[model samples]
Target: IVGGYTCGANTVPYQVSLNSGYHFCGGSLINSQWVVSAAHCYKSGIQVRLGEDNINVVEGNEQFISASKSIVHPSYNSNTLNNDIMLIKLKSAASLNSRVASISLPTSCASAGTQCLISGWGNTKSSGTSYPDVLKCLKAPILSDSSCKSAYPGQITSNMFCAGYLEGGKDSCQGDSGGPVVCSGKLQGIVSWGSGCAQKNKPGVYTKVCNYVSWIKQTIASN
Candidate 1:
């Protein structure tokens, strides 16, 4: 995350590091047995590390859970980046505690200009050589959908939304994919894609979680 700072432990209990052989994405615990992330981040054998703010060291509160099944949105398009949401069913349920908990899904769509937050252990600079050892966070305001559409031309579908500064300097970048975008304490979006890290007038794009609530619930219940 560019222009982000180290986050305090337990500040975002739902946050988790998504790893296959190594850390590549971020995720949020939505329930004891489910995790929500970007569909593009999905891969076979991906596992989740919960309750750890730092990826470099394992803490006592952390729990590693293997995914039993991974489900990408049926309509997710890699070419256009549409419907980039995904869900992972854990082989076993997570044990909730102060350091590990589920984040609440948003009840409605995030209005334009809403103040939100995003956190991850992603790269700190667009050209930087390293990912953060600890989770980092940044304040990103939701941009109007029209403004977002203008930035990406025909790429801004209804399934996606934008957040960040038009002037640049703050954003979720590479390795931050599949992370949560929390607005008003609710999970409003998932870090999906972007033009680049903190580029001027090209804010980060996210999967709009509100539009997929029914699909999420249905997937969980029927699976």
Candidate 2:
């Protein structure tokens, strides 16, 4: 995350690292066996690490699990980045503890202008080339869908929303995709995509989690 700092250990227990072989994407544990992430993060070889704050070295509390299956939203559109959500099924259920837990989904949509928290191990600066070893967290206010639409005309959809500063400097950037946007202690959005790393008038776009509650339930039940 651009303009963010390292988070405390187990600060966001639900947070997980989605490993795409050599790279990493962020994810949130919705349950012991299910992780919510961005479909765009999907690749052939993927794994997940839970209960981890620092990615540089393995901690005793960390649990490394392989993905048994990955279910991407059928309507996910790569071109426009619509419905950019996915769920990964763990080979075994996570052993919940003080160091690991699931995050709750939002009961309702997060209001526009609400300051939410986003955490990940993405870049620290717009021009930075390296990912941080420790997780980072930052506050980004939710932008109105109408306002977001104006920023990205013919691109914003109901399934997608926006967050970050209009003046720039705070946002989820590369490698932060699939991270959680928490509002009122609930998962409100998923870091989907953005024009760039905190560009002027280009707020970070996220997959609206409230809009997919039903779909998430159905998918989990069916799978």
Candidate 3:
């Protein structure tokens, strides 16, 4: 998140870092038993860290849990990056606290022009090894589907949406994928893909999480 601010402690307690050796993707603690992220972040042996702030330092609040299962949406299209959401069932339920808790999923679609918050430990710049130690965040308005389609012809889908400054300089970048885009206190989107971080006509593209609320609930219940 370029043109952003460092998130204060416990402000984003539902936020998480999807790690192997280091932070590779971000996630949201949707429930004590599950973490929601993007499908592209899925891999064997992925570790889930809740209440994480600095990736390099030991944050006492963190719950470093191993994933028991990683399930991608059945209709996910890897080549097109459509329906890119995923769920990570924790090996055990995360114990909730002030520094760790679950967030509610969006009940309906977000309105166009709605203000949203995106946070992650991704690169702060458009290029090169600038990943932050502390979590960073920024405000970006949700763009209408038509406007998003204009920005990326034949790329944006009904299951995805854009949120960022069209002129560039304040958007989610590499490694921010699988993170949260919260609006009205609900987890509305998952950081997925974009042409380039914070670039003109290329706002960050996210998995429209509202579209998957049913799938999420059903998956968790039946799995």
Candidate 4:
């Protein structure tokens, strides 16, 4: 996370890290048995680590559960990153507590200028490696669709939205995809993509979670 601070222990409990022997992305716990993430981060043998703060340190609060199954949106387009959402079913339900819990999903979209909380293990640079072991937190403003459409013309779709500083210096970067873009305590967006980590007029792009509520609910029920 660019221009962000290390989050206190379990302060952002629902934020989970995707692991295949190493931290590759981030996700949000929607329920004890399910996690929501970016489809692009999907892979076999994913172990979702909940209640995680520092990745390298063996924190006692962490729950290391293997994925029982995973479902990527059928309409997901890897090239354009449309419908860039995925659902992971845990092999066992996570035991919820003060330090581990699920986040509420967004039923509606967030408006432009809405200040939101964004957390991740992504690096501070657009390029190069500086992946943080401790989670990072940043407050960014949701931008209007027009703002994103202009910044990345022909690329921004309805399924995606933008947030962060237009002037640069603060945004989500590498290894942060699939992390939560929370607004008013609801899981609104999934950290998906960006032109650069934190560049002029190039805010971070995210999957619009509100647009997939029905699909999310249905998938969870069916599984």
RMSD of candidates 1 onward, in order: 0.9, 1.1, 0.9, 0.8
Candidate 2: the clashing residue pairs are none
lDDT of 2 by residue, 37-125 (tens): 99999886788999888887876789989999999999999998889999999999999987889999888999999989999988878
Which stretches in model 3 have alpha-carbon errors above 4 Å?
A: none
Q: What clash count goes with each model?
A: 0, 0, 0, 0
- Model 4, 1-223: lDDT tens per residue? 9988888989998999999999999999999999999999989999999989999999799999999999999999999999999999999999999888999998788999999999999997665668888999999999999989999999999999999988998999988899999999999999999987888999999999999999999999999
Which is better, 1 or 2, measured by lDDT?
A: 1
Model 4 poorest 10 in a row by lDDT: 124-133
lDDT string, candidate 3, 63-154, tens digits = 88999999999999999999999999999999999889888998889988999999999889876558899999888899989989999999
- Residue 49 lDDT in model 1? 93
After superposing all C-alphas onto the true structure, candidate 2 shows an RMSD in angstroms of: 1.1
TM-score for each of the candidates: 0.98, 0.97, 0.98, 0.98
lDDT value, residue 222 of candidate 3 = 92
Per-residue accuracy of model 1 over 136-218 as CA lDDT, tens digit each:
99988999999999888989998899999888889899999999999998999999999878888889999999999999999
- TM for candidate 1 is 0.98
